[PDB]
Amino acid sequence: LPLMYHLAAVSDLSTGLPSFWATGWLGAQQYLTYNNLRQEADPCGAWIWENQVSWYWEKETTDLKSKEQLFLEAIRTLENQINGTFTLQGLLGCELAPDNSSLPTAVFALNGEEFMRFNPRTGNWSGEWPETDIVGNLWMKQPEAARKESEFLLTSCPERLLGHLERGRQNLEWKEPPSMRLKARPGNSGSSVLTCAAFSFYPPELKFRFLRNGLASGSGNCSTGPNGDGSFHAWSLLEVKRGDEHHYQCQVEHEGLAQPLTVDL
Amino acid sequence: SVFIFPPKTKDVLTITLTPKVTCVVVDISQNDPEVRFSWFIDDVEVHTAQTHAPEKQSNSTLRSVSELPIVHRDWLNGKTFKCKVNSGAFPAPIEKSISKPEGTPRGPQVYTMAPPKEEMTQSQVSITCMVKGFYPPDIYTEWKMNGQPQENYKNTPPTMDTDGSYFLYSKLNVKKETWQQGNTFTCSVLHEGLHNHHTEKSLSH
Amino acid sequence: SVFIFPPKTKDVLGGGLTPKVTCVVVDISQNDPEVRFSWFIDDVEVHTAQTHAPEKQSNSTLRSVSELPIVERDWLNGKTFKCKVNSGAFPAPIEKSISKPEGTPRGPQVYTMAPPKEEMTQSQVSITCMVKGFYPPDIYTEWKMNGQPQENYKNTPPTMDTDGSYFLYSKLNVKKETWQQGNTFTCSVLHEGLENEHTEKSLSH
Amino acid sequence: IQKTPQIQVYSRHPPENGKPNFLNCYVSQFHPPQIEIELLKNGKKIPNIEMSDLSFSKDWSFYILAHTEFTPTETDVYACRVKHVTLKEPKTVTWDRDM
Ligand SMILES: *[C@@H]1O[C@H](CO[C@H]2O[C@@H](C)[C@@H](O)[C@@H](O)[C@@H]2O)[C@@H](O[C@@H]2O[C@H](CO)[C@@H](O[C@@H]3O[C@H](CO[C@H]4O[C@H](CO)[C@@H](O)[C@H](O)[C@@H]4O[C@@H]4O[C@H](CO)[C@@H](O)[C@H](O)[C@H]4NC(C)=O)[C@@H](O)[C@H](O[C@H]4O[C@H](CO)[C@@H](O)[C@H](O)[C@@H]4O[C@@H]4O[C@H](CO)[C@@H](O)[C@H](O)[C@H]4NC(C)=O)[C@@H]3O)[C@H](O)[C@H]2NC(C)=O)[C@H](O)[C@H]1NC(C)=O
Ligand SMILES: *[C@@H]1O[C@H](CO[C@H]2O[C@@H](C)[C@@H](O)[C@@H](O)[C@@H]2O)[C@@H](O[C@@H]2O[C@H](CO)[C@@H](O[C@@H]3O[C@H](CO[C@H]4O[C@H](CO)[C@@H](O)[C@H](O)[C@@H]4O[C@@H]4O[C@H](CO)[C@@H](O)[C@H](O)[C@H]4NC(C)=O)[C@@H](O)[C@H](O[C@H]4O[C@H](CO)[C@@H](O)[C@H](O)[C@@H]4O[C@@H]4O[C@H](CO)[C@@H](O)[C@H](O)[C@H]4NC(C)=O)[C@@H]3O)[C@H](O)[C@H]2NC(C)=O)[C@H](O)[C@H]1NC(C)=O
Ligand SMILES: *[C@H]1O[C@H](CO[C@H]2O[C@@H](C)[C@@H](O)[C@@H](O)[C@@H]2O)[C@@H](O[C@@H]2O[C@H](CO)[C@@H](O[C@@H]3O[C@H](CO)[C@@H](O)[C@H](O[C@H]4O[C@H](CO)[C@@H](O)[C@H](O)[C@@H]4O[C@H]4O[C@H](CO)[C@@H](O)[C@H](O)[C@H]4NC(C)=O)[C@@H]3O)[C@H](O)[C@H]2NC(C)=O)[C@H](O)[C@H]1NC(C)=O
Ligand SMILES: *[C@H]1O[C@H](CO[C@H]2O[C@@H](C)[C@@H](O)[C@@H](O)[C@@H]2O)[C@@H](O)[C@H](O)[C@H]1NC(C)=O
Ligand SMILES: *[C@@H]1O[C@H](CO)[C@@H](O)[C@H](O)[C@H]1NC(C)=O
Ligand SMILES: *[C@H]1O[C@H](CO)[C@@H](O)[C@H](O)[C@H]1NC(C)=O
């Protein structure tokens, strides 16, 4: 179970985006949000009620104001050397060493593709691109830069994480089995399509299995998505021989379920 | 007839830009110009191209173009891009394929050279740049005065040297006065063999 | 695809050999050889030529070599040379004419540059000859040591400049040593625009 | 590189004509992030919809969730419509009661 911050900055403000925003993730669930306008880092739904130290959220906001500035700088220092709008993104976080410690991550992407990396131990930015030099040098040209950024990943990160584990279990251990529903549509010509939909289940982990006359018949084409409820939604499609609709069933596997679940039309 | 062209070295070497693989089809005396286009990356179809409605030239023959936006690494890592053009008129589909020219990237050594004494009399002088020992011959070179990309320069084509690598010269032209005012002239080079794909050398006095 | 070729400016300008309006033929399997030759210098066929028997190459083709002799007079009078080949046993045959690039001769300004201060480190170093603004592109360059012609040099192709004229550079490569210990390095140029169709600058240390 | 949107429409709980539910429009796999997303009811702009914080996967492509309340009926057809650069015209994905 990892702690991952998704940071981003843009140039083109034609559609109302802030200039820089961010979101915190504990496993598959968001617990944090931030942007340059609200100027503060705040708790997401279910985490609002977690019990934390008084300065926890003080700390997330101040640590994000730093990164905001490093990104905003890059954005302008780039928008000047180069022609054409940009999108700065970075993936900052950690996973716990199965022996209390950090397993950091820090990669940055520019206009869709990766162009830079940070080593928190060595305190150095790596990268094979022109932009890697522009941005990478802009930051390294700040005394604070390396130190802070590094402490964020090696000290703060693993800490906050270990604290959400202790004080957040109710949330991370939460389980909810899906509600299944199988159906048939006219599909192609002289054919038909079976759809196995899974409703409102938590751990996004789920295994669809098709059954013809009882024996395995495939996996269809799985697609999972968020319900916005904090839960997830999933479906699988299987085109079959028209008329034979009824010889098939659908089965699912999930932690919400003690045993595999079989559904019919 | 069909033609396949690789991306500009500039777009490929700078992440912020967009490298495109191009496929052009000429000679079409008005057949079924709805000329289909199929692209593939490592033999996998893709529907991202940007085909541009045909165009008649000064020969009554129709022409067409399909640009495929490409991911900087797909190129640098060796992926093969194929574009197959189809048409009823055509017997069997015509297909072309290209990927980055094989070979260990050898990066250039760059040097700047002032106008020659004997030239210090004419109205305009010549600021020269020697770019040598690079391979493959995929490269980019431009001039900048005080960091301002300039226009009065010509690049020699890359020329295979004796040892297999390539070199080229790039000549910036300017009014003697501009040279003498002490402005800075910079030779900028983008080659995949250089650290961060780039390097630059300035000159003054 | 077979295009016509022009004479080595070395020959067409005094030299020793005789200027030959060549016409190389390629694109033929190792079993379908057939490319006749009928040269018409101004709509008049001249059997003055010699087609080196239909030889062949590895990639299954014909390393064709048909050489027609001409006069330095003809070439320099906007007079053309048609390489009309007659073959009735070859799909898409060939045929291409060529004359001197009609234009007022324009002499080059030649200058020599010493290996850059920073190249003075490397094993070998580069001795550069800038050959500025000349026309037509038919030129010839080479180096010499005290008087000794050399092999270790390469010429960029003639490159069109912003003002129509042309330029190219010639890089001579030598062991650092050959430099320190002064020597005669001379840029020898052959163009129909210099005084006596030749000139040559020199430098040492 | 720029990428085209992955538009998928579906409900929160199994749909049953008449009764209150929630319509979701998941837009993922795109780049750049500037985007315009809207839900429709028989063609009109269902208003006051909620949108999740904009995020992205390990591949750096952006995913976002648009959702509002609604109640199915054999008549009313709902669909999602987005506008992005990779899109020549605005793509409209119509809801499939079986997903
Ligand atoms: C009607 O007009 C059409 C267009 O207008 C032209 O009219 C004529 C009269 C001309 O004089 C001008 O007035 C106009 O340009 C005619 O179309 C032409 O058709 C010919 C047919 O052979 C095409 O020839 C090919 O040309 C390419 C080079 O094209 C580049 O340069 C052009 C200028 O010279 C430029 O216009 C092109 O755009 C193109 O430039 C590139 O463009 C792309 C995008 O478009 C950019 O991204 C690039 O940056 C830019 N590059 C730069 C820099 O310039 C040439 O490469 C082709 O050579 C191949 O074929 C030869 C013959 O078969 C062969 O000998 C070569 O070897 C080569 O083949 C490849 O060989 C390698 C190794 O040798 C192998 O590894 C490959 O496998 C092999 N190819 C493969 C994969 O099979 C070729 O000569 C010409 O390009 C085209 N004009 C256009 C458009 O560009 C039309 O013919 C005419 N109709 C008629 C007949 O009446
Ligand atoms: C089997 O192998 C054959 C030979 O072996 C080669 O194999 C390939 C794999 C190669 O990689 C090597 O391994 C081997 O060389 C292949 O034959 C080739 O076929 C192509 C077909 O297009 C020929 O292409 C033309 O090339 C000329 C340049 O040729 C010079 O340079 C060569 C080295 O690069 C050299 O080998 C040649 O000998 C030649 O050198 C000159 O040679 C003469 C005498 O031979 C000497 O006296 C000279 O000193 C020497 N010059 C110097 C110095 O080097 C190129 O100029 C042609 O360009 C024309 O066509 C283009 C495409 O149509 C077009 O874009 C250009 O613009 C140009 O067209 C002219 O354009 C101007 C203005 O732009 C117009 O004004 C003109 O009107 C117009 N032409 C006209 C009149 O219509 C062209 O690219 C290639 O030369 C040939 N190889 C040989 C032999 O030299 C064979 O293809 C292969 N079979 C296959 C396909 O499997
Ligand atoms: C992290 O900190 C630094 C900097 O990080 C940066 O590294 C980049 C490679 C890239 O990853 C960026 O994203 C990142 O921000 C790391 O140390 C750096 O090490 C490089 C390698 O030596 C060094 O590069 C030199 O840069 C200066 C200008 O800033 C250049 O002048 C110099 O060029 C000459 O030397 C190099 C090799 O030393 C040659 O490759 C060049 O070709 C050139 O040599 C000569 O030949 C060329 C041929 O064209 C000529 O043009 C030149 O004129 C000629 N040299 C002469 C005489 O000038 C180098 O490229 C960086 O300077 C250095 N970082 C800095 C800016 O201090 C560090 O290793 C890393 N930490 C860890 C833990 O590794
Ligand atoms: C390091 O801590 C690991 C996690 O345990 C923490 O949380 C509670 C369980 C608390 O009581 C403490 O144990 C820790 O703060 C734990 O699994 C490891 O055993 C610890 N390492 C050791 C052995 O010192
Ligand atoms: C199933 O998904 C694959 C994706 O790789 C697709 O190619 C195929 O057409 C789909 N078939 C179905 C079940 O509709
Ligand atoms: C920026 O580069 C030049 C600037 O003149 C031009 O191509 C355009 O304004 C910009 N690039 C494009 C084509 O998007």
mmCIF file with all atom_site columns, N, CA and C and ligand atoms in Angstrom, chain A residues 122 124-127 132-133 136-137 140, chain B residues 108-110 195-196 199 201, chain C residues 118, ligand 3:
data_model
loop_
_atom_site.group_PDB
_atom_site.id
_atom_site.type_symbol
_atom_site.label_atom_id
_atom_site.label_alt_id
_atom_site.label_comp_id
_atom_site.label_asym_id
_atom_site.label_entity_id
_atom_site.label_seq_id
_atom_site.pdbx_PDB_ins_code
_atom_site.Cartn_x
_atom_site.Cartn_y
_atom_site.Cartn_z
_atom_site.occupancy
_atom_site.B_iso_or_equiv
_atom_site.pdbx_formal_charge
_atom_site.auth_seq_id
_atom_site.auth_comp_id
_atom_site.auth_asym_id
_atom_site.auth_atom_id
_atom_site.pdbx_PDB_model_num
ATOM   1   N N   . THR A 1 122 ? 20.883 10.610 -3.460  1.00 0.00 ? 122 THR A N   1
ATOM   2   C CA  . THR A 1 122 ? 21.944 11.454 -4.063  1.00 0.00 ? 122 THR A CA  1
ATOM   3   C C   . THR A 1 122 ? 21.536 12.933 -4.161  1.00 0.00 ? 122 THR A C   1
ATOM   4   N N   . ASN A 1 124 ? 19.911 14.304 -6.751  1.00 0.00 ? 124 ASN A N   1
ATOM   5   C CA  . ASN A 1 124 ? 20.153 14.737 -8.132  1.00 0.00 ? 124 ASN A CA  1
ATOM   6   C C   . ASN A 1 124 ? 19.058 14.390 -9.166  1.00 0.00 ? 124 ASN A C   1
ATOM   7   N N   . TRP A 1 125 ? 18.777 15.335 -10.071 1.00 0.00 ? 125 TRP A N   1
ATOM   8   C CA  . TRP A 1 125 ? 17.784 15.176 -11.158 1.00 0.00 ? 125 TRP A CA  1
ATOM   9   C C   . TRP A 1 125 ? 18.402 14.592 -12.454 1.00 0.00 ? 125 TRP A C   1
ATOM   10  N N   . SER A 1 126 ? 17.869 13.466 -12.907 1.00 0.00 ? 126 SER A N   1
ATOM   11  C CA  . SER A 1 126 ? 18.359 12.763 -14.084 1.00 0.00 ? 126 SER A CA  1
ATOM   12  C C   . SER A 1 126 ? 17.418 12.941 -15.267 1.00 0.00 ? 126 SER A C   1
ATOM   13  N N   . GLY A 1 127 ? 17.952 12.763 -16.477 1.00 0.00 ? 127 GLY A N   1
ATOM   14  C CA  . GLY A 1 127 ? 17.134 12.903 -17.668 1.00 0.00 ? 127 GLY A CA  1
ATOM   15  C C   . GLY A 1 127 ? 17.874 13.075 -18.978 1.00 0.00 ? 127 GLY A C   1
ATOM   16  N N   . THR A 1 132 ? 15.071 18.463 -19.691 1.00 0.00 ? 132 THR A N   1
ATOM   17  C CA  . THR A 1 132 ? 15.638 17.941 -18.461 1.00 0.00 ? 132 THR A CA  1
ATOM   18  C C   . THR A 1 132 ? 16.699 18.916 -17.949 1.00 0.00 ? 132 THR A C   1
ATOM   19  N N   . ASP A 1 133 ? 17.416 19.557 -18.862 1.00 0.00 ? 133 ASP A N   1
ATOM   20  C CA  . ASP A 1 133 ? 18.426 20.496 -18.427 1.00 0.00 ? 133 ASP A CA  1
ATOM   21  C C   . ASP A 1 133 ? 17.763 21.787 -18.003 1.00 0.00 ? 133 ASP A C   1
ATOM   22  N N   . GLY A 1 136 ? 15.585 20.842 -14.719 1.00 0.00 ? 136 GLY A N   1
ATOM   23  C CA  . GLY A 1 136 ? 16.495 20.266 -13.744 1.00 0.00 ? 136 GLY A CA  1
ATOM   24  C C   . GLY A 1 136 ? 17.540 21.194 -13.166 1.00 0.00 ? 136 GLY A C   1
ATOM   25  N N   . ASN A 1 137 ? 17.980 22.156 -13.967 1.00 0.00 ? 137 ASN A N   1
ATOM   26  C CA  . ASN A 1 137 ? 18.979 23.110 -13.528 1.00 0.00 ? 137 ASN A CA  1
ATOM   27  C C   . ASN A 1 137 ? 18.362 24.258 -12.761 1.00 0.00 ? 137 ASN A C   1
ATOM   28  N N   . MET A 1 140 ? 17.828 22.749 -9.122  1.00 0.00 ? 140 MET A N   1
ATOM   29  C CA  . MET A 1 140 ? 19.126 22.498 -8.503  1.00 0.00 ? 140 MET A CA  1
ATOM   30  C C   . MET A 1 140 ? 19.867 23.813 -8.195  1.00 0.00 ? 140 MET A C   1
ATOM   31  N N   . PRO B 2 108 ? 28.641 14.392 -31.960 1.00 0.00 ? 108 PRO B N   1
ATOM   32  C CA  . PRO B 2 108 ? 29.506 15.403 -32.578 1.00 0.00 ? 108 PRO B CA  1
ATOM   33  C C   . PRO B 2 108 ? 30.414 16.193 -31.681 1.00 0.00 ? 108 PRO B C   1
ATOM   34  N N   . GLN B 2 109 ? 31.507 16.663 -32.267 1.00 0.00 ? 109 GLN B N   1
ATOM   35  C CA  . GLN B 2 109 ? 32.460 17.532 -31.580 1.00 0.00 ? 109 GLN B CA  1
ATOM   36  C C   . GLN B 2 109 ? 32.147 18.838 -32.283 1.00 0.00 ? 109 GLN B C   1
ATOM   37  N N   . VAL B 2 110 ? 31.907 19.910 -31.532 1.00 0.00 ? 110 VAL B N   1
ATOM   38  C CA  . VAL B 2 110 ? 31.570 21.175 -32.187 1.00 0.00 ? 110 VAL B CA  1
ATOM   39  C C   . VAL B 2 110 ? 32.567 22.295 -31.927 1.00 0.00 ? 110 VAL B C   1
ATOM   40  N N   . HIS B 2 195 ? 24.816 14.565 -24.667 1.00 0.00 ? 195 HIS B N   1
ATOM   41  C CA  . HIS B 2 195 ? 24.176 14.539 -23.355 1.00 0.00 ? 195 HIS B CA  1
ATOM   42  C C   . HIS B 2 195 ? 22.961 15.457 -23.428 1.00 0.00 ? 195 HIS B C   1
ATOM   43  N N   . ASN B 2 196 ? 21.779 14.891 -23.236 1.00 0.00 ? 196 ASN B N   1
ATOM   44  C CA  . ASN B 2 196 ? 20.565 15.667 -23.309 1.00 0.00 ? 196 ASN B CA  1
ATOM   45  C C   . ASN B 2 196 ? 20.279 16.142 -24.722 1.00 0.00 ? 196 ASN B C   1
ATOM   46  N N   . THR B 2 199 ? 24.023 20.644 -27.495 1.00 0.00 ? 199 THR B N   1
ATOM   47  C CA  . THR B 2 199 ? 25.267 21.305 -27.118 1.00 0.00 ? 199 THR B CA  1
ATOM   48  C C   . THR B 2 199 ? 25.365 22.612 -27.888 1.00 0.00 ? 199 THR B C   1
ATOM   49  N N   . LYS B 2 201 ? 28.200 26.227 -28.794 1.00 0.00 ? 201 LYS B N   1
ATOM   50  C CA  . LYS B 2 201 ? 29.498 26.905 -28.659 1.00 0.00 ? 201 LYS B CA  1
ATOM   51  C C   . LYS B 2 201 ? 29.396 28.332 -29.169 1.00 0.00 ? 201 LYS B C   1
ATOM   52  N N   . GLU C 3 118 ? 40.573 24.742 -29.693 1.00 0.00 ? 118 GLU C N   1
ATOM   53  C CA  . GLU C 3 118 ? 40.061 23.622 -28.926 1.00 0.00 ? 118 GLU C CA  1
ATOM   54  C C   . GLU C 3 118 ? 40.207 22.261 -29.597 1.00 0.00 ? 118 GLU C C   1
HETATM 55  C C1  . LIG E 4 .   ? 23.692 15.681 -11.213 1.00 0.00 ? 3   LIG E C1  1
HETATM 56  O O1  . LIG E 4 .   ? 24.302 16.988 -11.212 1.00 0.00 ? 3   LIG E O1  1
HETATM 57  C C2  . LIG E 4 .   ? 25.080 17.307 -12.407 1.00 0.00 ? 3   LIG E C2  1
HETATM 58  C C3  . LIG E 4 .   ? 24.184 18.065 -13.388 1.00 0.00 ? 3   LIG E C3  1
HETATM 59  O O2  . LIG E 4 .   ? 22.991 17.323 -13.692 1.00 0.00 ? 3   LIG E O2  1
HETATM 60  C C4  . LIG E 4 .   ? 22.678 17.371 -15.057 1.00 0.00 ? 3   LIG E C4  1
HETATM 61  O O3  . LIG E 4 .   ? 23.379 16.363 -15.795 1.00 0.00 ? 3   LIG E O3  1
HETATM 62  C C5  . LIG E 4 .   ? 23.039 16.288 -17.199 1.00 0.00 ? 3   LIG E C5  1
HETATM 63  C C6  . LIG E 4 .   ? 23.952 15.267 -17.846 1.00 0.00 ? 3   LIG E C6  1
HETATM 64  C C7  . LIG E 4 .   ? 21.564 15.937 -17.354 1.00 0.00 ? 3   LIG E C7  1
HETATM 65  O O4  . LIG E 4 .   ? 21.283 14.677 -16.749 1.00 0.00 ? 3   LIG E O4  1
HETATM 66  C C8  . LIG E 4 .   ? 20.733 17.031 -16.692 1.00 0.00 ? 3   LIG E C8  1
HETATM 67  O O5  . LIG E 4 .   ? 19.360 16.679 -16.766 1.00 0.00 ? 3   LIG E O5  1
HETATM 68  C C9  . LIG E 4 .   ? 21.149 17.231 -15.223 1.00 0.00 ? 3   LIG E C9  1
HETATM 69  O O6  . LIG E 4 .   ? 20.516 18.398 -14.715 1.00 0.00 ? 3   LIG E O6  1
HETATM 70  C C10 . LIG E 4 .   ? 25.839 16.083 -12.956 1.00 0.00 ? 3   LIG E C10 1
HETATM 71  O O7  . LIG E 4 .   ? 27.123 16.493 -13.470 1.00 0.00 ? 3   LIG E O7  1
HETATM 72  C C11 . LIG E 4 .   ? 27.192 16.969 -14.770 1.00 0.00 ? 3   LIG E C11 1
HETATM 73  O O8  . LIG E 4 .   ? 28.123 16.155 -15.494 1.00 0.00 ? 3   LIG E O8  1
HETATM 74  C C12 . LIG E 4 .   ? 28.197 16.517 -16.887 1.00 0.00 ? 3   LIG E C12 1
HETATM 75  C C13 . LIG E 4 .   ? 29.135 15.530 -17.546 1.00 0.00 ? 3   LIG E C13 1
HETATM 76  O O9  . LIG E 4 .   ? 30.487 15.935 -17.397 1.00 0.00 ? 3   LIG E O9  1
HETATM 77  C C14 . LIG E 4 .   ? 28.674 17.969 -17.039 1.00 0.00 ? 3   LIG E C14 1
HETATM 78  O O10 . LIG E 4 .   ? 28.573 18.351 -18.423 1.00 0.00 ? 3   LIG E O10 1
HETATM 79  C C15 . LIG E 4 .   ? 29.372 19.399 -18.852 1.00 0.00 ? 3   LIG E C15 1
HETATM 80  O O11 . LIG E 4 .   ? 28.550 20.573 -18.963 1.00 0.00 ? 3   LIG E O11 1
HETATM 81  C C16 . LIG E 4 .   ? 29.301 21.748 -19.340 1.00 0.00 ? 3   LIG E C16 1
HETATM 82  C C17 . LIG E 4 .   ? 28.329 22.931 -19.348 1.00 0.00 ? 3   LIG E C17 1
HETATM 83  O O12 . LIG E 4 .   ? 27.472 22.949 -18.209 1.00 0.00 ? 3   LIG E O12 1
HETATM 84  C C18 . LIG E 4 .   ? 29.945 21.548 -20.725 1.00 0.00 ? 3   LIG E C18 1
HETATM 85  O O13 . LIG E 4 .   ? 30.827 22.633 -20.973 1.00 0.00 ? 3   LIG E O13 1
HETATM 86  C C19 . LIG E 4 .   ? 30.723 20.213 -20.832 1.00 0.00 ? 3   LIG E C19 1
HETATM 87  O O14 . LIG E 4 .   ? 30.987 19.908 -22.222 1.00 0.00 ? 3   LIG E O14 1
HETATM 88  C C20 . LIG E 4 .   ? 32.240 19.331 -22.503 1.00 0.00 ? 3   LIG E C20 1
HETATM 89  O O15 . LIG E 4 .   ? 32.550 18.215 -21.656 1.00 0.00 ? 3   LIG E O15 1
HETATM 90  C C21 . LIG E 4 .   ? 31.670 17.073 -21.790 1.00 0.00 ? 3   LIG E C21 1
HETATM 91  C C22 . LIG E 4 .   ? 32.176 16.003 -20.836 1.00 0.00 ? 3   LIG E C22 1
HETATM 92  O O16 . LIG E 4 .   ? 32.680 16.570 -19.635 1.00 0.00 ? 3   LIG E O16 1
HETATM 93  C C23 . LIG E 4 .   ? 31.642 16.585 -23.243 1.00 0.00 ? 3   LIG E C23 1
HETATM 94  O O17 . LIG E 4 .   ? 30.655 15.572 -23.384 1.00 0.00 ? 3   LIG E O17 1
HETATM 95  C C24 . LIG E 4 .   ? 31.334 17.743 -24.200 1.00 0.00 ? 3   LIG E C24 1
HETATM 96  O O18 . LIG E 4 .   ? 31.415 17.284 -25.542 1.00 0.00 ? 3   LIG E O18 1
HETATM 97  C C25 . LIG E 4 .   ? 32.315 18.904 -23.977 1.00 0.00 ? 3   LIG E C25 1
HETATM 98  O O19 . LIG E 4 .   ? 33.665 18.467 -24.262 1.00 0.00 ? 3   LIG E O19 1
HETATM 99  C C26 . LIG E 4 .   ? 34.398 18.987 -25.334 1.00 0.00 ? 3   LIG E C26 1
HETATM 100 O O20 . LIG E 4 .   ? 33.920 18.460 -26.593 1.00 0.00 ? 3   LIG E O20 1
HETATM 101 C C27 . LIG E 4 .   ? 32.737 19.112 -27.097 1.00 0.00 ? 3   LIG E C27 1
HETATM 102 C C28 . LIG E 4 .   ? 32.354 18.407 -28.381 1.00 0.00 ? 3   LIG E C28 1
HETATM 103 O O21 . LIG E 4 .   ? 31.343 19.120 -29.075 1.00 0.00 ? 3   LIG E O21 1
HETATM 104 C C29 . LIG E 4 .   ? 33.010 20.592 -27.313 1.00 0.00 ? 3   LIG E C29 1
HETATM 105 O O22 . LIG E 4 .   ? 31.862 21.208 -27.878 1.00 0.00 ? 3   LIG E O22 1
HETATM 106 C C30 . LIG E 4 .   ? 33.350 21.243 -25.969 1.00 0.00 ? 3   LIG E C30 1
HETATM 107 O O23 . LIG E 4 .   ? 33.680 22.611 -26.175 1.00 0.00 ? 3   LIG E O23 1
HETATM 108 C C31 . LIG E 4 .   ? 34.542 20.532 -25.317 1.00 0.00 ? 3   LIG E C31 1
HETATM 109 N N1  . LIG E 4 .   ? 34.735 21.022 -23.960 1.00 0.00 ? 3   LIG E N1  1
HETATM 110 C C32 . LIG E 4 .   ? 35.189 22.257 -23.745 1.00 0.00 ? 3   LIG E C32 1
HETATM 111 C C33 . LIG E 4 .   ? 36.672 22.514 -23.962 1.00 0.00 ? 3   LIG E C33 1
HETATM 112 O O24 . LIG E 4 .   ? 34.462 23.178 -23.372 1.00 0.00 ? 3   LIG E O24 1
HETATM 113 C C34 . LIG E 4 .   ? 29.961 19.036 -20.209 1.00 0.00 ? 3   LIG E C34 1
HETATM 114 O O25 . LIG E 4 .   ? 28.935 18.589 -21.087 1.00 0.00 ? 3   LIG E O25 1
HETATM 115 C C35 . LIG E 4 .   ? 27.830 18.929 -16.193 1.00 0.00 ? 3   LIG E C35 1
HETATM 116 O O26 . LIG E 4 .   ? 28.451 20.206 -16.180 1.00 0.00 ? 3   LIG E O26 1
HETATM 117 C C36 . LIG E 4 .   ? 27.679 18.423 -14.758 1.00 0.00 ? 3   LIG E C36 1
HETATM 118 N N2  . LIG E 4 .   ? 26.731 19.247 -14.032 1.00 0.00 ? 3   LIG E N2  1
HETATM 119 C C37 . LIG E 4 .   ? 26.947 20.547 -13.858 1.00 0.00 ? 3   LIG E C37 1
HETATM 120 C C38 . LIG E 4 .   ? 26.138 21.509 -14.722 1.00 0.00 ? 3   LIG E C38 1
HETATM 121 O O27 . LIG E 4 .   ? 27.752 20.984 -13.034 1.00 0.00 ? 3   LIG E O27 1
HETATM 122 C C39 . LIG E 4 .   ? 26.084 15.102 -11.823 1.00 0.00 ? 3   LIG E C39 1
HETATM 123 O O28 . LIG E 4 .   ? 26.898 14.035 -12.284 1.00 0.00 ? 3   LIG E O28 1
HETATM 124 C C40 . LIG E 4 .   ? 24.760 14.566 -11.282 1.00 0.00 ? 3   LIG E C40 1
HETATM 125 N N3  . LIG E 4 .   ? 24.978 13.964 -9.980  1.00 0.00 ? 3   LIG E N3  1
HETATM 126 C C41 . LIG E 4 .   ? 25.270 12.668 -9.886  1.00 0.00 ? 3   LIG E C41 1
HETATM 127 C C42 . LIG E 4 .   ? 25.040 12.004 -8.535  1.00 0.00 ? 3   LIG E C42 1
HETATM 128 O O29 . LIG E 4 .   ? 25.702 12.001 -10.832 1.00 0.00 ? 3   LIG E O29 1
#
